[PDB]
Symmetry: C3
Subunit: 276 residues, 3 copies
């Protein structure tokens, strides 16, 4: 509640460390935490089968909530943690419950980089569904009412795009974190554009802030899954109106476009973790 | 927490359903819920006298909370009147504010929400006494965590992720202007963006200026949480704002101005809001009375 | 809940009023409450030694969470509080004395206007209550009707005459430190894009204080004079692209010292 949180963090670390003590023949000290958001659902298959990876369900780790698992293993030669299943503020969870896995994993003392992906709506007018955005700055709107993105890791991400011959666009710009769970209205998207937003999403920024608070480097990659509707709605005086449902955002579209970009995103992250 | 507003919603649904069952000879399936905000306090007198309308006090409905539900026929159509609404600046949560919408949704007949409210004019072309038909909104508190859908999703009502670019039905807005011409109403009816702020303070000049550049046409203290909840239930929405005052947006008098305009000039007041809402009430009454017959 | 909040306000005033009676020979009716922000707490040295000032720790005042200083400075009786319903409970408690008419609040603020430098002063003549627009508001809940209105205007929050007074006192005191007139944006919890957004919204200085106290004082009918100390210029320019190769406290002290004598 006030200090039970710290005991909960210590308790979860005791569990994870003791499980890493039984599973791995040698000391497993992960250097990267990969929050497998959109586009990273299948990167767990890129974990090496040997040494056999350790899979911890959230139900057994103290403090970890559900409504999820931790994967400890080697990817591209480097030891990493993948957390499949993330908590969101719009689901009712508190900010502490959302970033509790990061604070527990930080007690291992070996992780020094957070790599996180998420879906995002395109606010920048030149953005198209299917593009990626490397985040170099953010606006925390919920934090407003109650850099941080490592330059070398961003340089590294673009070098791996060239090395892998990935044709997919990867922009640079600002990511606005909003609470959700509603998609933005037309006037809200226009406001976000005026505020300097390039893409908008409802996750990631709280984990980034906690990761920076723990001294970790951060690399954040947004998947532009849709282009936010910005045009004013059809006037009642228009005899030939554009239907107000045309181009509406949809979770099915977010899911489909996340999966379409997953092969490129997983290849980029797999190449990056070898040089963390 | 999801399991106990579900229990509260279903409990409130039966209490309304059972007393709709005893009161009306023919079963009462209302087409619309009319939130009687500013300009609609008197529309209860437009309810047809037969069949006998049913009035349910909030104090006797589980989960609810001045305040009553009026079940009757208006211009031939069965409706529910929300006479008295909960505001968030009074300390109530958003879940308590929109709980009547979810409970009334279980009647399975309502597919349109008609809601009015008072609003300060941010658009410079707006005058006190004008009306604004809402076709878009800015939910700035929702962007920052003050959202009526926060928490576990009511999967039986709507999707976890809800679009709002289609929030304000076009056919209902055209029907509203069609009734303005039919009734020969000369009052101005604009079409613009409504911004929901928490209150209970009136906006400072810098807050009104910020809302203006953000794209606001009129700023109010209610409605948007109910519109979002109704849209989550799949309802069509017709929102109508009453421009009760013109927001002070010019920067305040500077200390080095030797011909300063008094900073207290044109300040907003609750009495001006009340009196302008009353003056426009007859027009708003007539408009909603005609619209309900064609929803 | 308001019933218990009302009793705690009365208890705090009943304690404060009783202590003023025992301490001061002549009855003490303070005319201004001066809130001393961080780094600007040394203003307590500007209170006259005679009559003897009264210092009440917050821990001794019922309902409070720092110290309250009751004394005379420049001949005027004032209250100094050295250091959301909790934050403004002291304002409503002190209002029950029936004498305070002015709130003078000072704070440290980050510079959003590009023309500001660290060390500059800014006289607040407008604010943006971001938390209040979203739900974190000092007046949320049942209204204190005995204190003020359910709906309060904020377009007349920063008294013009009190601002004209401050500027007059700077010329008199030959203070050369620049004093700007601008908007203070209140944020509860910045990035370059966040600082850029504030500038686009009309922010001249940003911080996490002042505004809730200003609203509560305005709800009580007080006049408000707000002064900000620019401690740093918030960076606004975007970060590098992956493709490229303390003396002001005495100045504030002199200003408040000269202002309180002619409020
Ligand atoms: O349009 C959007 N809005 C908010 N969050 C999102 N996440 C993916 N797309 C979107
Ligand atoms: O100026 C206003 N601001 C906010 N809400 C309002 N409701 C009526 N007028 C106003």
């Amino acid at each position: 509640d006030i200090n039970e949180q710290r005991a909960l963090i210590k308790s979860a670390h005791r569990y994870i460390s003791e499980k890493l003590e039984d599973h791995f023949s040698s000391e497993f000290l992960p250097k990267a935490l990969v929050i497998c958001g959109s586009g990273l659902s299948g990167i767990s298959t890129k974990i090496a089968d040997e040494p056999k990876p350790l899979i911890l369900s959230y139900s057994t780790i103290p403090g970890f909530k559900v409504s999820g698992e931790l994967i400890f293993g080697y990817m591209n030669g480097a030891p990493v943690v993948l957390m499949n299943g993330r908590l969101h503020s719009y689901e009712g969870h508190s900010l502490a419950e959302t970033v509790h896995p990061i604070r527990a994993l930080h007690l291992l003392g070996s992780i020094n980089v957070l790599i996180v992906t998420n879906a995002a709506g395109g606010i920048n007018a030149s953005f198209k569904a299917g593009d990626l955005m490397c985040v170099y700055d953010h606006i925390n709107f919920p934090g407003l009412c109650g850099d941080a993105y490592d330059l070398e890791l961003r340089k590294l991400l673009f070098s791996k795009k060239k090395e892998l011959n990935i044709e997919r666009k990867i922009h640079e710009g600002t990511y606005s974190y909003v609470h959700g769970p509603t998609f933005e209205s037309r006037a809200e998207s226009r406001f976000l554009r005026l505020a300097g937003t390039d893409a908008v999403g409802m996750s990631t920024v709280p984990e980034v802030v906690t990761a920076r608070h723990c001294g970790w480097r951060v690399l954040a990659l947004s998947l532009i899954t849709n282009e936010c509707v910005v045009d004013p709605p059809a006037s009642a005086h228009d005899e030939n109106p554009v239907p107000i449902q045309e181009g509406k955002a949809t979770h099915e579209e977010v899911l489909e476009n996340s999966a379409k970009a997953s092969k490129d995103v997983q290849e980029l992250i797999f190449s990056v973790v070898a040089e963390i």
